[PDB]
RNA sequence: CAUCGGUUCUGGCGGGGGGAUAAAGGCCCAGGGAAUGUGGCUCCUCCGGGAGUGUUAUAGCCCUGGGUGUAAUACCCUCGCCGGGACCGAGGACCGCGCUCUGCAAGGAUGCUGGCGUAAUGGUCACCAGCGACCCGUCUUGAAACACGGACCAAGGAGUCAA
């Protein structure tokens, strides 16, 4: 849903004379900024607590930035969604290198696979498998294997397509 | 001369503030709440076809008249419901000073005697606004950027501002809400890349 | 409103001209109701009698406003606060004006509506956040 | 007769505002923050930021 | 079937504008309809919601689990 | 063509600020850990390679803290500078606001140059080409359709006068 990134969103109750100090509550929103992310975080807030947009503030907003991009890892989202039968769980895995990229991967292929939009989908967890064996799809099941070198058949050459015209057949072998 | 550099000072003060006082509430570990704007921007981006009567009210009674037209709204909660009931038609947002600057700089009209007039000249804003103590251009946009007591008269000065279409275009759909991926509403600060692209 | 004796302080209010006033019928004592209509309204007295009062209400009419008098005994009438928050207001203000007068110092005179909340420094200390899935986890269960 | 934009002409921007010739002469949108070493960020607030 | 050498008499996806306004028409008449029913239904209907779960394929069940133990202790001994 | 003014499109460059004073990352320092287990060792073998072992060895990786470091960069906001192009020149002594003040980009285009001085520009008509374009009245009703009138042309032809 867009180029997403995750922000820390704590807010809370606003203060009264009976509770001079109401709690706080933080969640971790992926959003593409940060008006869609305090708009989600007081959906949620709706929908757990007793808190609304006019009797409560957003205390804080804090972009949350991965903390290692350049290392490839495996990742297990837990999600919720909407479909005319019901709500539905699925556990996925995504072999990304950043939780947002992963969030993004899953909010396409949840698209593409159960037409699934933005609106009909709750993200509930996602986590990093820290170890190989916590890998339960196949398809990454196959990511993670020993020694993988596969070639690449049947490509396609990268003509412009202002050049209408070719002289030769192309190859597709390199 | 001398009002102009202590408006400048003023400005670079108040951001440095704002900065320090977040860096101090981190460091001490809590959070500094800024505090919640003062000032929107509100332009008509919908047509005057096929409209209730109430959203008409309401936009006659913010002078919002004619698509692509840009008004300076005090945030307070009497406007703050008339802004709510209008939505589906403006969109609305917190601009910063360089926005101010600009729009007042190149679309800056004032209503002498009902007539719309170019602010090509200090003069016009000492006759027409000398009274509260706003003589120069520089004046003009400290009390629209500031919100001082004399905003009311200020922004009913000033003509509401004609825009332009703006460059690049709107979203894919635009009489929608920028939450959903729209137009309308709320953008709080990203109100300031549709002043570029409409001014 | 319970069924038997009507309280006996509705007879010990004093009711002068220009007063607003709200019209509540009392079911119990049927001499002296207004119409079904006229019920509930709210109006001026203009004529205070031994034991009914003159009120002034607007009836509208089509495309227009018809003024109407009615005279109402004081057991379905009873005073009206919508004016109770201009006269403690005038007092309080006037009050004010002169002791700011006396002063020097001039002082805000317009009520002002809800403003916009200033920018405050809000601790974490012994008020820890919590972290909220978008289920909780004691539902899953 | 012909109004004239000052983010454009700076005879007019000079006209409306005599500091814009002091402004860009002492590079006033240019100014460099304070000096000083700046203290790191209290360990706890990362904590918070990276708390699942 | 014989369609290939002989195919019959092709079935236009081309839509009428009559057709169209008069489905649009019943369409909304059918959503309206079905309100009323709504409003009028007598069939019960729970106030909680069933909740899906938490699935079995998730690795760190176990761990969910567990910080579920010492938040509802924690909250009976704050209780 | 040059120098300008108004509007606008587009490209590049120099800075400033913010966030976890970006997050990374490199080079060092101090710990801990594991396998998609490196070297070594052992056992099978088609001896091509596999299998077991354990924590760096004759590869490396991950996690935590510290120094360089106020590192760089991305993103957002912002202050300016330099190009390339298009359309437009309203007014007609001075006055005004100004500035970089012998003057000027400051209340609206001037300077230089060339060809021609006539159907060359321009206009009218006929035709072709691209795009657009249902037959007029009247009536109906909310409207359309239906229905009614129209072969063509010239002249005549319908809210007047009195009280």
Request: glycine share 6%; charged share 35%.
């Given at each position: 849903?867009?180029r997403?990134?995750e922000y ?15 709690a ?7 959003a593409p ?8 975080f007081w959906?949620?807030?709706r929908?757990?607590k007793?808190?609304?947009?006019a009797?409560?503030?957003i205390?804080?907003?804090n ?5 290692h ?9 837990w999600?919720?969604?909407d ?10 895995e995504?072999?990304?290198?950043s939780?947002?990229?992963?969030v993004?991967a899953?909010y396409?292929?949840?698209?593409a696979?159960h037409?699934?939009?933005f609106r ?5 967890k996602?986590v990093?498998?820290?170890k190989?064996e916590?890998?339960?799809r ?6 993670v ?16 397509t202002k050049?209408i015209?070719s002289?030769?057949r192309?190859?597709?072998?390199s | ?6 408006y400048?000072?003023?400005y ?11 860096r101090?509430?981190?460091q001490?570990g809590?959070?500094?709440?800024p505090?919640?704007?003062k000032l ?11 409209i209730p009567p109430?959203?008409?009210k ?5 002078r919002l ?7 300076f709204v005090?945030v307070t909660?009497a406007?703050?419901?008339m ?12 601009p ?9 700089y190149?679309?800056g009209y004032?209503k ?7 602010l090509?000249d200090?003069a016009i804003?000492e006759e027409?606004l000398?009274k509260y103590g706003?003589?120069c251009?520089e004046d003009?946009?400290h009390?629209i ?11 009913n ?6 825009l332009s279409?703006?460059?690049?275009g709107?979203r894919?759909?635009?009489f929608?809400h ?12 990203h109100?300031?890349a ?6 | 409103?319970?069924?038997g ?6 007879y010990?209010?004093t009711?002068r001209?220009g007063?607003?006033?709200?019209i509540?019928?009392?079911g119990?004592v ?5 119409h079904?209509?006229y ?9 205070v ?7 002034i209400?607007?009836k ?17 009438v009873?005073p009206?606060?919508?004016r109770?928050?201009?006269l403690?207001r005038?007092?309080?203000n006037a ?10 110092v001039?002082?805000?005179?317009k009520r002002?509506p ?8 809000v601790?974490i200390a012994?008020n820890?956040p919590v972290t ?10 | 007769?012909?109004?004239?934009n000052?983010?454009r002409?700076?005879?007019?921007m000079?006209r409306?505002?005599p500091?814009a010739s002091?402004?860009?002469?002492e590079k ?6 304070e000096?000083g070493?700046?203290?790191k960020?209290?360990?706890s607030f ?6 699942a | 079937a ?9 079935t236009?996806?081309r839509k009428?504008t009559?057709l169209?306004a ?6 909304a ?15 019960w209907?729970?106030?909680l ?5 938490i699935?079995?394929?998730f ?5 969910l ?7 509802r202790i ?6």
């Open positions: 849903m867009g997403l990134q820390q969103v704590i807010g809370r109750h606003l203060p009264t004379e009976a509770n001079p100090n109401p706080l509550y933080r969640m971790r929103i992926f900024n940060e008006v869609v992310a305090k708009s989600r959906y949620f807030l929908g757990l007793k808190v609304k947009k009797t409560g503030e205390v804080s907003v972009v949350i930035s991965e903390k991009p350049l290392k490839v890892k495996n990742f297990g989202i999600l919720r969604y479909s005319r039968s019901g709500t539905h769980n699925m556990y996925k995504y072999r990304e290198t939780r947002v990229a992963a993004e899953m396409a292929d949840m698209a696979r037409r699934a939009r009909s989908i709750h993200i509930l996602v990093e498998l820290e190989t916590d890998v339960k196949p398809y990454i099941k196959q990511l294997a020993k020694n993988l070198s596969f070639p690449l058949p049947h490509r396609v050459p990268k003509i412009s050049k015209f002289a030769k192309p190859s597709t072998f | 001369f001398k009002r102009a550099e202590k400048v000072k003023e670079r003060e108040q951001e440095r503030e704002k900065i320090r006082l977040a101090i509430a981190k001490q809590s959070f500094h709440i505090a919640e704007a929107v921007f509100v332009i008509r981006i919908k047509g005057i076809n096929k109430k959203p008409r309401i936009l006659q009674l913010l008249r004619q698509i692509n037209n840009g008004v005090k909660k406007t703050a419901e802004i709510k009931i209008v939505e589906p038609w403006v969109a609305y947002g917190y910063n000073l360089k926005s101010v600057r600009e729009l007042i190149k679309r004032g002498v005697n009902g007539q719309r007039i170019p090509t200090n804003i027409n000398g706003i003589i251009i003009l946009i009390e950027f500031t919100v001082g007591p004399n905003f009311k008269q200020a922004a000065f000033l003509w509401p501002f004609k279409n703006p460059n690049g709107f894919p759909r635009k929608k920028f939450i959903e991926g729209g137009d309308l509403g709320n953008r709080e600060e109100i300031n549709l002043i570029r692209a409409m001014n | 409103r319970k069924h004796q009507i309280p006996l302080s509705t010990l209010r009711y001209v007063d607003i006033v709200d509540k019928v009392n119990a049927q001499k002296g109701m207004p079904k209509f019920h509930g309204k709210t109006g001026v007295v203009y004529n009698t031994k034991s009914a009062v003159g009120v209400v607007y509208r009419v089509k495309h227009r406003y018809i003024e109407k008098r009615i005279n109402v005994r004081i057991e379905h009873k009206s606060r919508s109770e928050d201009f403690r005038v007092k309080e009050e004010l004006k002169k002791k700011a007068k006396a002063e020097g001039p002082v805000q005179l002002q809800a403003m916009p909340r200033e920018a405050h420094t601790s012994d820890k909220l899935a978008p289920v909780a986890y004691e539902t899953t269960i | 007769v012909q109004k004239k000052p983010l002409n700076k005879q007019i000079l409306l505002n500091y002091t402004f860009a002469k006033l949108g240019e100014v460099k923050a000096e070493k700046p203290p960020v209290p360990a990362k904590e918070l930021l990276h708390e | 014989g369609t290939i050498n002989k195919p019959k008499k092709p236009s996806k009428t009559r169209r008069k489905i649009s028409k019943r369409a008449e059918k959503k309206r309809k079905e309100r009323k029913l709504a409003r009028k239904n007598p069939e209907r729970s106030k919601k069933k909740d899906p779960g699935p079995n394929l690795p760190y069940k176990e761990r689990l567990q910080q579920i133990e010492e938040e924690r909250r009976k001994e704050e209780l």
